[PDB]
């Protein structure tokens, strides 16, 4: 059975820590984007975005997407990333 085999697979490998690592890397990427490319906030005001191991990090990201007028929400992560990269590129082009 597919579901029974999935429970066996989960015992072979618990993906939780790797999903957590991916979240961290994703958050670090957002932080680098804000710090070096979007630069929407004052540097003093990026502290909450920077605190990537916080369980409240998504709340801050939601405020960030609002603050830069991103048309996507956090739940649409792939679209938010692409949009923020597009914004970063347009901000970067022409010094
Ligand atoms: Cl998030």
Residue numbers in the entry: 0 to 94
Paper excerpt:
The human RtcB ligase ortholog RTCB, also referred to as HSPC117 or FAAP, is part of an essential heteropentameric tRNA ligase complex (tRNA-LC), along with the DEAD-box helicase DDX1, as well as FAM98B, CGI-99 (also known as RTRAF or hCLE), and ASHWIN (ASW). The tRNA ligase complex is an essential factor for both tRNA biogenesis and XBP1 mRNA splicing during the unfolded protein response in human cells. RTCB is the only subunit of tRNA-LC that is essential and sufficient for RNA ligation, but it requires the protein cofactor Archease for multiple-turnover catalysis.
Structural modeling using Phyre2 and PCOILS servers predicted that both CGI-99 and FAM98B comprised N-terminal calponin homology (CH)-like domains followed by putative C-terminal coiled-coil regions. To verify this experimentally, we determined the crystal structure of the N-terminal domain of CGI-99 comprising residues Phe2-Asp101CGI-99 at a resolution of 2.0 Å. The protein construct adopts a globular fold connected via a flexible linker to an N-terminal α-helix comprising residues Phe2–Asn18CGI-99, which is stabilized in different conformations in the two molecules present in the asymmetric unit by crystal packing interactions. The N-terminal domain of CGI-99 (Phe2-Asp101CGI-99) was able to co-precipitate a minimal FAM98B construct spanning residues Arg2-Lys184FAM98B, indicating that the CGI-99:FAM98B interaction is dependent on both the N-terminal CH domain and a predicted beta-hairpin motif (residues Glu145-Lys184FAM98B) in FAM98B, and the N-terminal CH domain in CGI-99. Taken together, these results indicate that the formation of the CGI-99:FAM98B heterodimer is mediated by the respective N-terminal regions of the subunits and suggest that the N-terminal CH-like domains of CGI-99 and FAM98B may comprise an independently functioning module within tRNA-LC. This heterodimer further serves as an interaction platform for the recruitment of ASW, the fifth tRNA-LC subunit. There is, however, no evidence to date to indicate that CGI-99 and FAM98B, or indeed tRNA-LC, interact with MTs or other cytoskeletal proteins.
